[PDB]
Amino acid sequence: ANDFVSPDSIRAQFSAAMSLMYKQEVPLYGTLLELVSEINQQVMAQQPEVAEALRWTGEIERLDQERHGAIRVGTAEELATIARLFAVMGMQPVGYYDLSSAGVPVHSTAFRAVHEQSLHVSPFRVFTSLLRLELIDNPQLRELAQSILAKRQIFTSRALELIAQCEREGGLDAADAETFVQEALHTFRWHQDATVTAEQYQQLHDQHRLIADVVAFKGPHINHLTPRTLDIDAIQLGMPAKGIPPKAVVEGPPTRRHPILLRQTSFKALQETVAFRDQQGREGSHTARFGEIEQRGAALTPKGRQLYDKLLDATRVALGGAPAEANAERYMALLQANFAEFPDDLAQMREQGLAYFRYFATEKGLAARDQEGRPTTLQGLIDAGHVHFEALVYEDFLPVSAAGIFQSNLGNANREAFEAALGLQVQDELALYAQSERRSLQACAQALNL
């Protein structure tokens, strides 16, 4: 037909380019990647069941480069335009996170691909928050932020041209995709020179460090990039030795044979300097960049997430409120005890409808595909070894803040306001998981001549 490259391939290239840029800016991220690779190879060598699970789902091939990014934007126009940028790469808005509950003036979505085959080529996802200036009570500070954000243009003209070209023509060829990746990178690069005066930065920062992070810079720099490890417990044991001691509180469920959602922790990655126009030849302020690591397990159904939320809430009530480093050991013990009630058996997770799964025809099943008298049900085919299943991996967010901006774990006027700013409706991640499960069953039925 045409010579356009796949949006999935652009996404993979963009993720790799973002990772190279971030590693140049934050060398301890490179240190983390080396540790992740070694941990992951150890798991696959020592745990054949994990290696086989990743083979069945195709995740073995996506794992090494799998990342998420997090960014914050300041205006509705920025959010709507960034949705168009991400669409070039097959990254659509999935989910709505209203973080005003946890005491942060933002609401968010995650831009990512949605179909198992797309995700196999690249599962790159960018959690994108929009600052809500109307939640800044001090009028003078809100007016300052609005004035500063209105002046900035976070996209290069060439990036905007290529986005419009992609929309009008239906894609980009390889050369234009390469140009697009490099132009898009400018939006996310770190810029030391703040766009405000030293005093303006001071006012923005004391209200909330997140407000200065958004308002005082040229654009939405990478807040962090997070690689995927197969064993967060193991990586935590290796991190202090590399100068990235992480938080003892691990967000998410406790250690499980069959992980659910994701587990996360964070560390201090770099102390950065911020420079101002009015105070040159003088010491500029400093700001910390935080890193993160995650392990991704099974996507949960509504019923599964209700159980997860219940047991996590019970853990927090038993602790007395806020999990902190000072009570980390007690919290982790309470977490393990309360989550004993969440089945840690794939067969029960499936039969009780707690997680999503993908199903696959086995070699034994394929060899029998012309036999009569085979089992008449899905369970019978599983029991006879004709169908194999594995959990469908979670692609979304608890969410958690590496920089400690909000309390962890979350998910109509606010949603309507978000979607009006975004320019479209967010997709339902749970519906998308159900569709992936259903597609696997249909492919299995065809492969087995059922």
Ligand X SMILES: O=C(O)CCCC(=O)C(=O)O
Of 92, 129, 287, 409, which one interacts with ligand X (CB under 6 A)? 129
- Residue from 113, 166, 398, 426 touching ligand X (CB under 6 A): that is 398
At 118, which helix (H) or strand (E)?
Answer: helix 116-121
CA gap 263, 296 in Å, rounded: 7
Residue 95 sits at φ, ψ, to 5 deg, of 85, 160
Closest CA relative to residue 362, chosen from 390, 340, 338: 390
Determine whether the annotation assigns residue 400 to a binding site: yes
72 annotated among ligand-binding-site residues: yes
Out of 225, 405, 444, 448, name the contact with ligand X by CB under 6 A. 405
Applying CB under 6 A, which of residues 12, 39, 63, 70 lies at the interface with ligand X? 70
Pairwise CA distance, residues 258 & 256, whole Å: 5
Q: Which two tokens stand for residue 223?
A: 């807040």
Question: Which of Ni ion, ligand X, none has residue 223 at its interface (CB below 5 to 8 Å by kind)?
Answer: ligand X
Binding mask 99-128 for ligand X (x = CB under 6 A): ----------------------------x-
User: Out of 94, 177, 381, 400, which residue is the one contacting ligand X (CB under 6 A)?
Assistant: 400
Q: Which is nearer to ligand X, 92 or 108 (CB)?
A: 108
Number of residues that bind ligand X (CB under 6 A): 12
CA distances from 439 to 6, 248, 361, 442, 443 (A): 21, 40, 13, 5, 6
The residues with which 126 forms a beta bridge, in sequence order, are 69, 111
Tokens of 49: 């069941």
CB of 78 to ligand X, least distance (A): 15
Give the C-alpha separation, 211 to 71, whole Å. Answer: 13
Neighbours of 353 (CB within 10 A): 12
The answer to whether 224 is annotated as binding is yes
Closest to ligand X by CB, 73 or 274? 73
Span from 66-74, 95-103, 234-242, 345-353 in contact with Ni ion (CB under 5 A): 66-74
401 binds ligand X (CB under 6 A): yes
Question: What character string, x for contact with Ni ion (CB under 5 A) and - otherwise, covers 277-316?
Answer: ---------------x------------------------
Q: Got the DSSP string for 132-164?
A: -GGG---HHHHHHHHHHHHH---S-HHHHHHHH
Q: How many residues bind Ni ion (CB under 5 A)?
A: 3
203 contributes a contact to ligand X by CB under 6 A: no
Task: Pick the piece of the chain touching Ni ion (CB under 5 A) from 8-16, 70-78, 276-284, 405-413.
Answer: 70-78
Quick one: 230 or 400, whose CB is closer to ligand X?
400
Which member of 35, 54, 70, 85 binds Ni ion (CB under 5 A)? Answer: 70
Q: Which residue has the tokens 């939320």?
A: 309
State the Rg of the chain over Cα. 23
Separation CA 300–CA 313 (nearest Å):
17
Tell me 290's DSSP state: E
155 contacts ligand X (rule: CB under 6 A): no
The Cα 262–Cα 66 span in angstroms is: 14
Binding to Ni ion by residue 36, rule CB under 5 A?
A: no
Cβ contacts of 33 within 8 Å, gap of 6 or more: 19, 23, 227
- Give yes or no for residue 274 binding Ni ion (CB under 5 A): no
Q: Which of 230, 403, 426, 444 binds ligand X (CB under 6 A)?
A: 403
381: left (phi over 0), alpha (psi -120 to 50) or beta: alpha
What mask, x for binding ligand X by CB under 6 A, covers residues 217 to 256? ------x---------------------------------
Closer to ligand X at the Cβ: 187 or 362? 187
DSSP labels, 370-402: T-SS--SSHHHHHHTTSEEEEEPBP-S-----T
CA separation for the pair 312, 317 (Å, rounded): 9
Confirm or reject binding of residue 121 to Ni ion (CB under 5 A): no
Give residues in contact with Ni ion (CB under 5 A): 70, 226, 292
Binding-site positions = 68, 72, 224, 292, 400
Give residues in contact with ligand X (CB under 6 A): 70, 72, 127, 129, 223, 397-401, 403, 405
Binding-site positions for 2-oxoadipate = 68, 72, 224, 400
